[PDB]
Amino acid sequence: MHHHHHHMNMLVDGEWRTDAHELTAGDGSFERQATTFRNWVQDDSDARFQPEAGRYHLYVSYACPWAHRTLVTRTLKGLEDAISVSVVDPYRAEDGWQFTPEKEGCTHDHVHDVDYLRELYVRAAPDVTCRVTVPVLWDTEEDTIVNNESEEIMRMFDTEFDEFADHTVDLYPEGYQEKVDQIIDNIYEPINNGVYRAGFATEQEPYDEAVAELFGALAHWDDVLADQRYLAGDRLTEADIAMFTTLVRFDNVYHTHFMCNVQYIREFDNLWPYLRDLYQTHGIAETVEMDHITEHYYTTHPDVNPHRIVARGPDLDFEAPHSRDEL
Amino acid sequence: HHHHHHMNMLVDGEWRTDAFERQATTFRNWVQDDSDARFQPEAGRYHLYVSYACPWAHRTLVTRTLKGLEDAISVSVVDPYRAEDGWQFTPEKEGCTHDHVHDVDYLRELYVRAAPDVTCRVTVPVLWDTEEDTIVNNESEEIMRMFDTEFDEFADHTVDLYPEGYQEKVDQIIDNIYEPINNGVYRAGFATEQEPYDEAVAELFGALAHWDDVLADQRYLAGDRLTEADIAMFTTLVRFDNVYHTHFMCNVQYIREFDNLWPYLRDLYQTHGIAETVEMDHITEHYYTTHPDVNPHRIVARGPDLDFEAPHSRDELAGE
């Protein structure tokens, strides 16, 4: 959420720029100058955005682990019929996230048929100063951006659309919520944001800390997952979805491209069968587009990988059997 | 050979940033233990120029230590950090020495001195004759066999890294792993197009899986005894999991993830003397800092926690 690639652009007072130097001195200063979108869809008769069956639209990239969080939840809940989705081009440049429908896995902007994602922001907030990112939950009635945060879109997908979900799945169950909210908050900095902090690191000391904290955090949850099947233990929750979207991209991208190369995830005793256990959860596998993932990270970051060569990566057997059902 | 995108060159004696191997001159003279030869083996005549980072130069160091020619043949260590002026001498720096021959600032000076208008790339290793005041040899394999066979009169240990009855296999292994393994990682690393990288990675890991199969039932590459072929493989393997895997994006599988290649590497490392010839800090610093078009912000990766010193069981297989 907080770390962005060296050539990432911006919208300033409703204007697309390649860089705004007056807002880019010091660690992530632009984001403290940025506006985000934090409205909620609430199952409440008084609420502004009430959950309907054919109203809200979702914008994602298959490569983004933050957007991927919304996709995994949408599939688990069975909200595809209820909530439509557009897939942006995994490759992006001077114009940010773009729509390339002819490209495999990508579609067109189902709402306004825009060329770029930045057009959608401008329509929703003509004077906005922010980053054009995914995911974006869009309301077709008010014609604007409802929410812009992976964590909260996942949550409201989980707890607010029960009337239209096809599956009786509860990824935020009673008695687990406090711990689920705890795990999500913990793994957020050393693991979710940690890999990008290490990858876009410009000095040695920040990289060292980002790597040390990361694999330290991974080792902790590896010991925790030795005696309990999931992060919150007995049940599959949002906490697992947050962890999964990072882990699934670690050995093909983060390890090499972002130089987080202390250890493979597949070398961990418990995290690797855990990742296989999640990947094989019915429906999740179809939300994983590795071709989108590898193409984005290896060819969209010029200052990290100049010649834009897509690395091959390990031959990962995600479909390899586990034994964590014995927990 | 595949060199990095910022690799400069010596052209007609001049030092230039911008312009090729097939347009370049090399040094291919030999030291021969024969009465007529131009360069004959002596006990305090030849000087070795190496970098602890470079695997090619690493071959000459390993062999030198094995035979016991540390007192016969002197050595200088250039600065792991290279730039606008090529390999340089920085005596203050840990592990580095000064030019013991002419107190030269940049290795390129020695090349020009030995050959006034040479067109070549300033590389290591460099075998230097302090009598004719010129470069003797310039290739890793030739200097290695030179150190191994011709200097028997000035050795300290009676080791034979090129023994009779095994020689024919030794030489063939050496040029069978040259392109896919030894030079392959650089082909993949400095690749600018997707297709060559795909090939380079494919042939490299195809080759690694092969010798991992072979070394499962035999202790060393040529079989029964330690060998120059093992020296060529070692200087690459010991730089894989820390550099080649990540920096050069050869990330299909760790060397430590192999059944046989990993204890085999631990077997070579722990052999007497080979432990001291490894300077991982020189290795990690050079590749992550001297390749601006491979690693722009020049951040040194942490790498895995490799325990080369961990006990193995390949002594169970018959060998030294």
Numbering used by the authors:
A (entry chain A): -6 to 320
B (entry chain B): -5 to 13, 23 to 323
Manuscript excerpt for this entry:
Glutathione transferases (GSTs) constitute a superfamily of multifunctional proteins widely distributed in nature and they are found in both eukaryotic and prokaryotic organisms. The main role of GSTs is the cellular detoxification of several xenobiotic and endogenous compounds, including drugs. Xi class GSTs form a distinct group of GST enzymes endowed with glutathionyl-hydroquinone reductase activity and show homology with the Omega class GSTs. The present work describes the cloning, expression, purification, crystallization, and structure determination of NmGHR, a GST of the Xi class from the extreme haloalkaliphilic archaeon Natrialba magadii ATCC 43099.
NmGHR was crystallized under high salt conditions and diffraction data were collected to 2.6 Å resolution. NmGHR displays the canonical GST fold with a N-terminal thioredoxin-like domain and a C-terminal all-helical domain. The protein backbone and relative orientation of the monomers in the dimeric assembly is remarkably well conserved between archaeal NmGHR and it mesophilic counterparts. Furthermore these values are comprised between 1.2 and 1.78 Å when directly superposing the dimers. These observations suggests that not only the canonical GST fold is perfectly compatible with halotolerance but also the quaternary structure, posing this class of enzymes as one of the most structurally conserved when comparing halophilic proteins to their mesophilic counterparts. As expected, NmGHR is characterized by an extremely high content of negatively charged residues which are evenly distributed throughout the surface of the protein. An interesting feature of NmGHR structure is that the histidine-tag present at the N-terminus of the protein chain to aid purification is ordered and visible. We could model in the electron density the complete tag including the initial methionine of chain A, and almost completely also of chain B. As shown in Figure 5A, the tag sits along a wide cleft between the N-terminal and C-terminal domains of NmGHR. However, it may also be noted that, under this framework, the amino-terminal group of γ-Glu-Cys is as close as 1.4 Å from the side chain of the methionine (-6) that precedes the hexa-histidine-tag. This suggests that, in our experimental conditions, the histidine-tag partly occludes the enzyme’s G-site, possibly explaining why our soaking or co-crystallization experiments failed to recover γ-Glu-Cys in the crystals. Therefore the absence of S-glutathionyl-hydroquinone reductase activity that we detected with the classical substrate for Xi class GSTs, i.e., benzoquinone, might be due to the position occupied by the tag in high salt conditions.
